[model samples]
Structure formats: structure tokens, C-alpha cells
Target chain A: VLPELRRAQSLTCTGLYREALALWANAWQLQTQLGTPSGPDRPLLTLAGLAVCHQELEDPGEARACSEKALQLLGDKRPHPFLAPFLEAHVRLSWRLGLDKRQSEAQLQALQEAGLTSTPPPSLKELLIKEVLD
Target chain B: VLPELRRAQSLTCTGLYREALALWANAWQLQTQGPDRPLLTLAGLAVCHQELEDPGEARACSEKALQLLGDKRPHPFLAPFLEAHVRLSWRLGLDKRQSEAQLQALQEAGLTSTPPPSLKELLIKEVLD
Candidate 1:
């Protein structure tokens, strides 16, 4: 489901969380066929993608769970357009869930130090509320 | 294979007939997997055949696409379907007087295998820092 995953992120970036979310869950479903990392990683890319899609679509429960899981799989290192957006979603998800909001800030700085931007306020415009009105 | 079909048409339009042929064929097989007799892929296959100097298969695919549009069957949207019909008519010298009579500038702008005029030079006028 590599192509499925690629199309998923592409759609998600364009604010089609409603459309993009299916492919994310499909990416998660198909990746279940792969062998384990035994340390309990469910598949890093889908987790990252799901966190954003779930956050956008208002599934904060899985949003935070999968976001935390992806950061765990990625460990406390590295950056991406993916990582930072998910990190930005991390901040937004933190605020949405009302759980340990300040920790997400450490990684927002972590994102910037790694030369990526994690701007959540504007990213919110790229989320569910935008999908509804227009 | 939506992207494949889209890329195939783009390749055909830009004069990459040989590469477009394989992609069009792959797109054909994928489309055939479902219960579909889509004009879109047939139109693309028509172009690939015409450009590679195979009027036999060119008219084969081209005429079938025409059947879909020209028959009592429900016709496709006028953009690519009409656009492709015009190109096939031009290349094969098939009479498209009726088809061309219905459309205008958007269809005519694609007369060549290349794209229409570029606007890069025009854009630089506003790019001053």
C-alpha cells in the first residue's frame, strides 16, 4: 500500500481528511501483513499519517495515541515535513485532548532546531473545520 | 490507476508516444479489471496508436471511442473526450466537422504534440525583489 500511503499523505496535505482518512486506515490495515518490530511498533508512517487525519477529523483519542506511537517509533530524533506537521498536530492534539500540553512544546522547539517549522494555529485552518464549510 | 491514466495522457500530449503507449496499455488492463468501457482510456490509446504510425490500432481504438461518444450511449464530459476525438480526427484525417463545430479554443490550442505557448518570460516581469 505504498502508493495508497503516498496518495493518502498527498490528499491529507491538501485538506481532504474525510477522503484522506480512509487511505490512512487502509494503509494501517494493509501494513498489518508485515512482520513485527517486536518492541510494538504498529507501522511508523501510518501512525504519523493517522495522527493528522484523526486530529483533523476529530478522533482525538486515536490521534494522540498514534501520534505518541509514531514519535516513539521515530524516537526523539530526526525531522520531516511529515514529522513537523505531525508535531504541529501534536500541539493541536494536545490542546484538543487537554493532556500534557507543554510536552508537545518541547518537540515544537525540537522541530525548529532540526530546521522544520511547527506552526499549529495556521495548520488548524488546514483541518476539519475547513473541510466542513467549503 | 487514475494517476497512470492521467500521466499517460500528459505523456501523449507532450509527444512521448512510445512511453505513453506502455502506460496506456497498463492503464487499459487496470480499467478493464472493472466492468468499464470507459472512453477516457480508449481515447488515450487512440493517440498513442496514431502517433506511433499504427493507424490500424489507431482507428481501432479511435473508432471505439467515437462509438462511445457518438452512439446512443451516455456521452462523457466534453473536455478530454471531445479533445481526444478532435486529435484522432486530425491525425487519421477522419471527418470531425461535427465534433469540431461543437468546440473551440481549448481544443484548438492543442494542435501540436507540444503544449501551448509558455508564460515563464511573462511571469518574470512581476518577480523583482
Candidate 2:
């Protein structure tokens, strides 16, 4: 699984997008075949991978779909490792598709409940996102 | 900026590969000419945008980065009102990256810190990450 993940990552970095998607699809299939849904982490993580691949490939619709599924899987579950990344996905999907006003608003409320913000840390990509989006 | 963002997002969705990044480059240039870095909300939001388009490897990288920034300034930053759309540029770069060591350490710590069982949150990405 780790090797497959590394290959997917490499494909993404090198711009072999379809190949990356294929890899993830394969991984998703393998997981299902293995019937290892005993843990919540695996599905959510796979959703994250699929989400990024779809987003990078310029498929917001697919990306959003995967995210929604992941969110459902994570329902009422406190972030065990780190919750920032999952939350970040909601913000990004909103910014890109421009149709998640209600969802984004709700996320902000959640963050407020968790005592966190909706903005990302200062960095090159952070600035780049601002420059490009707004 | 808005057009480019849309284009980049479209590229991401359509599987056009490199075209999306090209649009982002164009948008970044326009942002520089505008010379408007007054508030932080814009920047943070932009970061979210970049993180999404070609979110790169870490899967959770930009999300974590955005969340970290928000966590630091929980009250939100003082910035001019949001423009037509939320966007901005970064000094670092546009790849979805993460702090591996810190995260790995956190994972280990989480195991020891939590003593009780709770509802299971199921997901492929976060669990794998």
C-alpha cells in the first residue's frame, strides 16, 4: 500500500494526472477487496487522496463528491491525528466551486466551536492562493 | 484573479494537467500589480485556493497550514472586507506539502494522550495520512 501511495505521489508531482487517478482508483479497489473498513482512518485518508487528485486534475465536482463522502465518514469524530487538513479541504472546495456558502459558513462555525480559524498559515502557497483566487 | 482561479480549478477538474497551473501563474501576476496586501483574511483564503488546485502530496498539507494559521489568530485578522472573491499569493510556493516529523510525532502522542474510546471517524485519507 505504501509503495502504491509513493507511486501515486510521484505521478502527481510529475504531472501524470490520469495515472495518479488510476493509481488511487486501484488503491481504493484494493482496500475494498481487502474488506479492511474496520477503521475510520483508512477511508478518510483515501478520500483525501482522491480529493487531491481530482482537484489537481481540475475536477472540482469529483473532488467535492469525494470530500462529502469523507465528511460523512468522519461524522462526529474528533480529529485524532490533526484536523486541519480535513477542514482545509472544505475551505478550498468552497473557494474553487463558489457554491458551498452554506457549508463553508457551517465549517467556520465548527472552527469557532473548536477555537480555530478558517485561514491558512502564511507561506508562498498561501500568498499564491490569495493572489490567484481573490 | 477570479478568472484564473476558475480556469485553474477547471483544469484540475477536467484533467487538463498543466493548464490549471498556467492560469494560476497568470492570476499571481495580476495580484502583484494590484499591490494589495492590507489584510490577512485575503491571504489566508488564497492559500486555501492554491492548496485545493493541485493540492499536491500531503493531502492534508494546505488544510493543515490554513488551519494552523487560523488557530494562531482564532479571533480572525483585521483586514479590509472580502473582495469579490477570496484570494492571495504566498512567499513559499503552491505545492500541498506537510511537516512530516511533527505530524508523525503527533500521531504517536495522540495514542498516548487519549485514554477513552469514542465514535469512530472513518475516512481513507486522514487515516492513511
Q: What's the fnat for candidate 2, on a 0 to 1 scale?
A: 0.05
Query: CA lDDT of B105 in candidate 2?
Result: 43
The runs of at least 3 residues in candidate 2 whose Cα sits more than 4 Å from the true structure, single-residue gaps closed, are A76-134, B1-129
Give a tens-digit lDDT track for model 1, residues B47-118: 566567665665556445434433432111223233334444565556666645544554455542133221
Model 2 chain B, poorest ten-residue lDDT window? B76-85
lDDT digits (tens) for residues B1-129 of candidate 2: 455565665555565545654564566566557012212223333333454564432223434334544443211001100100011101123221222232244346553122212111111111111
lDDT of 2 by residue, A1-134 (tens): 54676577666656677788888777777766664442344454555567667766767666656645654454444432223434445455556655444654566567657755444522333333333231
Give lDDT: candidate 1, residue B61.
62
Error of model 1, residue B17, in angstroms: 0.8
TM-score of chain A of 1: 0.47
On a 0 to 100 scale, what is the lDDT of residue B104 in model 2? Answer: 40
- Deviation in angstroms for A24 in model 1? 24
TM-score of chain B of 2: 0.30
